[PDB]
Amino acid sequence: NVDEYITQLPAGANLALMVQKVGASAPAIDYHSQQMALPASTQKVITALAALIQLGPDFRFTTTLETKGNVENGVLKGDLVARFGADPTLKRQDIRNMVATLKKSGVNQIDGNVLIDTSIFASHDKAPGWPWNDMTQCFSAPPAAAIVDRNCFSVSLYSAPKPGDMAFIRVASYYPVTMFSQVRTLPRGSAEAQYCELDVVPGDLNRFTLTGCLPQRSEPLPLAFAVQDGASYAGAILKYELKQAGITWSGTLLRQTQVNEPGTVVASKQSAPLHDLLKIMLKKSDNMIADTVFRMIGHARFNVPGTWRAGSDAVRQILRQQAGVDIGNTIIADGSGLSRHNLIAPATMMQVLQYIAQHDNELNFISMLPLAGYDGSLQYRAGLHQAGVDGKVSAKTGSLQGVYNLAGFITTASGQRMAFVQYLSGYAVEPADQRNRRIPLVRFESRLYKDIYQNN
Amino acid sequence: NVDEYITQLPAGANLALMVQKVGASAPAIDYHSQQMALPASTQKVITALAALIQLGPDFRFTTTLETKGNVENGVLKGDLVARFGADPTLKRQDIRNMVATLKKSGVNQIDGNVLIDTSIFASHDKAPGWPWNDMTQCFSAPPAAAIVDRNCFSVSLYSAPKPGDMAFIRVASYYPVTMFSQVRTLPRGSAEAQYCELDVVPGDLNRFTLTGCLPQRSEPLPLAFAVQDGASYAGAILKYELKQAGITWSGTLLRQTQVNEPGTVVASKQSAPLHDLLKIMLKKSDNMIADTVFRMIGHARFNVPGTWRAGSDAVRQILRQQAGVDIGNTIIADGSGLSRHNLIAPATMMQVLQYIAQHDNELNFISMLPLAGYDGSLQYRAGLHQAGVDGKVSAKTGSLQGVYNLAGFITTASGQRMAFVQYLSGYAVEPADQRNRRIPLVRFESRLYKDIYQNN
Asked: Which residues in chain A are contacts of B310 at CB distance < 8 A?
């Protein structure tokens, strides 16, 4: 009763839906299944499959400290190279530990430069089609080769005691960022409060200026921002840890972007295995893992510095050649599904899902998807809970402004496993319902998945 | 025969279409007319109507030089204020002329600062939902309060005679930008040519670094880029013209962002009348005119510094209250339709078109739209030409990656004027047809508009 369920959805919402028994050639439900749609985070299903095929479940991201030169009386005669490898999980502590190791190896002094090597990747750290306005939010932090603590930092914004005085920014001293406040404090219920925005404006070298207005508050406003220049940020952390460890240097911090022969690895850190990271990515919808993986795929397949375009070409090739899926006129712009350039039909995603199901005993893939009523994004998906399908749906959510997708598998009343793709976009509510916007979605899903479960 | 014409379109393309006699309550063609879609540049139809209602056809953008202080023996004892007003047509020459006027007024020296006043607007000069990657292209130049020559500048990129040497940037000395090249010159058919990108990276104060690779060429590559900091850019031009005119100052160039009482206007420039600018906007799809107008509407309606959110609220209010159109769950994010956040149903745009037709003798609006086979965007729209409808269609195009819209009016074989909205999105061709992508569109439109013209 797809058309009737659509009446639950806001005026003009667009649904493309396909449901199909695993291993069957014909769908049980086909509503606009050929129509292109924004996949949002369902794109991560494709990223996870292509990653497992190209890189394998045991791949690990790697970061190293390398020396190029002889060490004489504790003095490295040459450069220290910190070779970043797009590990989305690298932490300040890992840098501290690698420096401790460098020290313990006998290096007290560097007679040369400290090089921040990001040559594993090239071109922009932002995919085409990402909205500019989200770039300072942590969920959209540029997934660069140099990442430390997700390239996200927090700040506290304090209103001034006196109205008209600048609001005050508190930030932990260890973060190599520079914060400036041009935020005017307003009276508690002021005229300017309506249309005066509070904005973050990023500048070079990880400078941030906050601008606009802040109404007086009793509590500081917590804010978290994305680092725009990961290489500089990682360099500054490395510089700090070297100094704390008592290692001096005569040169400067420089970026190294061009491919080069590795020196002697003196310290290293490897991530958890790729399967573990893909699990986090799928359960929690982790954009940074998705997009580091995505540019890694292109780098590994074509033996070139990883770019968005190489990633896209690689994923298309892997799907066609290894998974037997010709994605045709599909557009793949990134790994996370953040890009508004991604375009894919339910029928194409269905072929991907059918491949995964057929090879699930090899891939151990379905266990990584959120299980309705248990974990990840579907721990409490109201429509699925109310449909009676908790524990019966393993699926990836995909949400962006105007988009509420689901793609995955459902075990129905007969015990039949069905792959399904729900692509719902053009979703908008009227201004007076914007912070209550999800109730129509719940109504729709409660009905559809009860229908699918009961009748199959 | 809408469904059959759709077979001309690429796999999975999404059409929402409505055609309706002017003044009629029921549509002649209704194919998904209630469904939300990306309007692209058809949004400019709404912007033009709301602008004429709020500002009127005779509104002019204004830029001034103002003095605050007494002038003693040719010395201004106080500040020079350059008050920008978002005029999208202001030129270097206009600044030169206003400075000439300031000189002629008796000011030889400023004992104070030179203030670049942008207080007419506030918050970001980029609307929510604009893709970040286009921001350095001139068609997406941030439409700031301070614009000079469309905040666009050109550059010539020369490959190095020797492979491996940096490519060279030539730029006219009068442009206050700073260009850096890290572009490596490659052999004419090299290995790196495939996945090594040529990129522009904007920095603070109108710095641009070009990075990546450029294959050797006999001719320099012409490039044009958008200015990211219009206030600094306009300030530098003002500084240059003051110096050339022999006016000295003791202070510095500072930005003035807060609303303030105007000083004595000593020089000014007003744009052409708004109706003339709206005509350019509609004929040529001028994003900068659309978006300066859009933030001006909010500024004029609410008497606040213009923002994107004030513009959106104002346009919704104007449509509902003055045009009798409740846009319901429609999202309006900007004036140009660049934003991927814009969402509107053909039926809503249809109400706008019906209003314009009913009031055309008041507004003189339809004459501003491109006329098929004559001007603007429709001078050679192949599908319309092949449909036999040249001289019979006045309509606004809307194109973005994946989107080919038309909205406007058609005079049919019976002489009946019909309003129509064609919203076609999810348009994608396979990699091997991307630079030939428009042929399916032409096939579709040739058929649809011949059908509409002949049968109505």
From this structure: 195
Residues B94 and B10 in one domain: no
- Distance between CA atoms of B433 and B449, rounded to whole angstroms? 25
Q: Which residues, listed in sequence order, are joined to residue A183 by a DSSP beta bridge?
A: A212
B202 with B341, same domain? no
Question: Which chain A residue lies closest to B192 (C-alpha atoms)?
Answer: A304
Catalytic residues of A: 41, 44, 285
Domain limit, last residue, from A271, A304, A327: A271
Contacts of A101 (CB under 8 A, 6+ apart): A65, A266, A267
Task: Give the minimum alpha-carbon distance from A418 to chain B in angstroms, rounded to a whole number.
Answer: 23
Amino acid B392 reads: K
Does residue B237 sit in the same domain as residue B156? no
Cα separation, A137 vs A227, whole angstroms: 9
Q: Which residues contact A338 (CB under 8 A, 6 or more apart)?
A: A127, A129, A130, A134, A140, A287, A291, A400
CA angle A58, A59, A61 (to 5 degrees): 135
Specify whether A222 is located in the same domain as A237. no
Helix (H, G, I), strand (E, B) or coil at A287: helix
Method in brief: X-ray
> Looking at residue A100, which CATH number applies to its domain?
3.50.80.20
Resolution in A: 1.5
Contacts of B326 in chain A (CB under 8 A): none
Q: Of A11, A122, A197, which has the smallest distance from its Cβ to B328's Cβ?
A: A11
Could you tell me if A108 and A249 lie in one domain?
yes
Q: Is A84 exposed, middle or buried (0-12, 13-18, 19+ CB in 10 A)?
A: buried
If one counts the domains in chain B, the total is 3
Question: Do residues B454 and B306 both lie within one domain?
Answer: yes
Query: Cα separation of A409 and A393, whole Å?
Result: 6
What residue of A is the nearest CA neighbor of B429? A329
DSSP state of A427: -
Q: Which residues are registered as beta bridge partners of A14?
A: A425
The values of phi and psi at residue B368, to 5°, are -85, -20
- Contact state of A428 with B401 under an 8 Å Cβ cutoff: no
Mutation to test the B interface, candidates A124, A135, A213, A327, most B Cβ within 10 Å = A124
Q: Are residues B301 and B444 in the same domain?
A: yes
Contacts of B196 in chain A (CB under 8 A): 122, 304-305
Tell me how far apart the alpha carbons of residues B432 and B435 are, in angstroms, rounded to a whole number: 8
Residues of A in contact with B126 (CB under 8 A): 132-133
Report the distance separating Cα A209 and Cα A203, nearest Å: 8
Q: Which of B204, B331, B430 sits opposite A329 (nearest CB)?
A: B430
Q: How far apart are CA A288 and CA B341, in angstroms?
A: 23
Look-up of token digits 């109310």: A386
- Tell me how many residue pairs between chain A and chain B have CB atoms under 8 A apart: 155
Could you please report the per-residue DSSP string of B249-281? Answer: ESS-EEEE-S-----EEEEEEEPSPHHHHHHHH
| In a shared domain, residues A261 and A362 | no
Nearest CA in chain B to A10: B329
SS3 B142: coil
What residue numbers of A does the annotated binding site for substrate cover? 396
Q: Looking at the DSSP assignment, which residues form a beta bridge with residue A28? A: none
Domain containing A168 equals 122-229
Which of A229, A253, A282 is the last residue in one of the domains?
A: A229
What is the Cα–Cα distance from A368 to A277, expressed in whole angstroms? 10
A75-83 and A114-117: which strand pairing? Answer: parallel
Would you call B239 a catalytic residue per the annotation? no
